[PDB]
Design a protein around this nucleic acid. Sequence first.
DNA 1: GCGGACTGCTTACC
Length: 898
Amino acid sequence: MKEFYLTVEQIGDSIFERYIDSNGRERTREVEYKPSLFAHCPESQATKYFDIYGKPCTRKLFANMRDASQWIKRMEDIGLEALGMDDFKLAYLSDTYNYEIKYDHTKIRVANFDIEVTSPDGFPEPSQAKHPIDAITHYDSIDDRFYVFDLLNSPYGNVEEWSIEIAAKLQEQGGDEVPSEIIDKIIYMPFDNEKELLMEYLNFWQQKTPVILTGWNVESFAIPYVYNRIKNIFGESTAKRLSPHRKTRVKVIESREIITLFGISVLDYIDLYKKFSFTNQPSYSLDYISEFELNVGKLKYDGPISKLRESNHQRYISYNIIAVYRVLQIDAKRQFINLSLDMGYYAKIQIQSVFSPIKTWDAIIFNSLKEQNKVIPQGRSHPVQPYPGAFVKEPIPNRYKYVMSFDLTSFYPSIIRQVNISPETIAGTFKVAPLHDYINAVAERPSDVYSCSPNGMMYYKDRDGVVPTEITKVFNQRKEHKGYMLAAQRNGEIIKEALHNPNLSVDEPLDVDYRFDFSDEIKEKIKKLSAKSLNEMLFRAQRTEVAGMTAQINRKLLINSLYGALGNVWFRYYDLRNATAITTFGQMALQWIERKVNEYLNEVCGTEGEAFVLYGDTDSIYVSADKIIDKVGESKFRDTNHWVDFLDKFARERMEPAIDRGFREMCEYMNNKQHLMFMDREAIAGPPLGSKGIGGFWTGKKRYALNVWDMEGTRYAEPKLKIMGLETQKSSTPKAVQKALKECIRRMLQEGEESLQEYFKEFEKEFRQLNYISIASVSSANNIAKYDVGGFPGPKCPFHIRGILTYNRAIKGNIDAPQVVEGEKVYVLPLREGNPFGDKCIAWPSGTEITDLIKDDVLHWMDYTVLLEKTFIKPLEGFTSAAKLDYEKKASLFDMFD
DNA sequence: GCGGACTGCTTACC
Ligand SMILES: Cc1cn([C@H]2C[C@H](O)[C@@H](COP(=O)(O)OP(=O)(O)OP(=O)(O)O)O2)c(=O)[nH]c1=O
Ligand SMILES: [Ca+2]
Ligand SMILES: [Ca+2]
Ligand SMILES: [Ca+2]
Ligand code: NA
Ligand code: NA
Ligand code: NA
Ligand code: NA
């Protein structure tokens, strides 16, 4: 097999690489790499090197990386560009791996670990590491084993060994329910003192040195804790064994620390999750995320974690092992490790650089160019500067019965490709008319020869640009995975339907690839399967969809980030002319098709001057279809699904071709390199046939709800609410309020006003019995100190911050009580007037029960009246006025009767 | 007292 790197670092004039050789063994080499950089040279000096602008360069080879760096400074001291890749390990990788890297993930050592530290004096600061590490569990992907390091003897208590027998038993048996599928994978090691544990851990580490190192908060807690504890016990030299090149770097933010372990690639799972999951969670405790991602139960114990080792060491160790397994389970579902390796090897970068789309693209573009013997420009300093973005129509707040939406495929990247926007394809400029002159096809055709954006920029149509070229490569990967996702999703609905009439029999899940639409043979079998087998198939489908979602949405993110990066001053190819070329063209494309679409519908409906498009944001249009439906008459339809089929067809056969024509003309108008504005139907929405449901409503920009029957070719088994912007979607809204508000909306859109009012009456009556956590608001807790004045709210102190201060006063002098962490999230509750806390709200760390010290008092004093009116009624009022309906029966003349 | 204009902060939508 082809070789592939695992890790690369630069240490002085040396490149240290770990790699898998052609016989699949892991090696390590130190290479005294001799890099090249480039200077512009006279045109008379023949060469094979040119900058992206076609100017010739001479290659300078250096004796070592140090001389290359010093020459860069000198060149600045002179005032001349020093071209080429200045990140030498990216050059090294490019030289060394001059081909499409095919990697074998089974050859890559992925380690997942988690440590426990009993601390009586609150949270154990990693920079200090005052307290013994009393457990480590460390899963090795090569061995497929959980290595458990259990401290039996500590100044905080001596305990008996953990029992694997008991670990495996059900909780109802007094066991820990350590998943049976890992019991035989546990390698348990007890120790009679910390020193021996740590030294054994290190010796283990040498033998099985991680390439990818992950876990949950491992970068901000586990790694710096382990590093410093070993450092403070055995000394710096021993601590450095954690690095396969015995080099570490302490990066400090005082007094926190991030340790950099040379030769290892740390991908903290919490950071992968935040960047790639596309969620915003009220809490990021592994407990909370596990329950959310896997539907497993919150782990239970009877005391504070601070005493868990002492009172139930058996459970303490089982829970440490489980914590490690939960991340593996989340990754098996979400697959962010795979994504990282994929992306990393594609760009040819340090795997941890997947967190930086700028580095990722610098690398991809560098390799693409190096390929053609081209030379990349030197990075330059630029001041930060604002610039305009998308257009968003101002909707008329109202209900809207029948709606179909359309959306442009990969919008900004398609503009990049269509127009041919790249640093080196710029041709010149033209004098711009006002934007609406272009939108209205009234302005003078910008250019006859070059491809144009209405911001004034022209680009060459002939030449290929490296930006369009490389963004197209990733776009095509995105498109492949999205197909798998959507097919898996369609399969899913097939399975959900057949689950309505399951055969009462015994059988097994069919062996099928859910990435592709089921064959008619598969469907026939399906409709003969047991419920058991069907539910298992449905699980596998949904898992295939998630896997597809991760792969597609994150390649989407990467290419949109290339768009973004053109407007970041740290990007080698920063250029506000290209950034604006894109967003301005987009503003045009949208408002142009609003016109064409409006024109086309008035026509085929024989109408004149009616506004079909009621909304659009960036690149989408939401079309009111009341009149399309009305031209046929509702009575012409057997059932809901009937007219849904109707609009699917109508949109497919009539509308899209018109839009196709509409954009082809725009392409012509701008003389663009290639027509790539592909706008397909998105959602079909409307009330159930015969129902009094209102179908949909908008409250304003970015705030709407629709009752959807078909989404991008997925015909749902039951209608799905698509709600955007409203409080049901926001992590800051209490859980029970979200659920309640969503049910009000479901009722409005599906059933009608009378339903809504019934539900509201009931909610109002019973809502005081809801668990406090479910009615707590959530907020991020930033700049607590900024607003802390002697324990009390400084000027302009935000509501949630006030609540934190209320908390800190209430727990003052309880070293043990949970502290609110700067930057992390808090639950917030309002308190009734005259409460013992001396303020109107109180806040505590999200994801947690409020400390027993004050919990009872908080519950007594919660302000249910404010909670309800402020978090539930106000939003509800907003929705219903928008839609023209009442959530309470107004007082009327009829009141005078019985 | 407190509405309305502004501001900081938060978290959506693309
Ligand atoms: C979601 C998102 C969009 N955008 C911009 C660029 C997107 O092309 C444009 C439209 O947003 P989207 O329509 O949501 O995404 P998309 O058009 O790029 O790809 P697709 O619709 O096929 O799933 O908004 C960003 O810049 N950053 C983002 O995170
Ligand atoms: Ca001993
Ligand atoms: Ca789009
Ligand atoms: Ca059946
Ligand atoms: Na159980
Ligand atoms: Na869109
Ligand atoms: Na689409
Ligand atoms: Na199409």
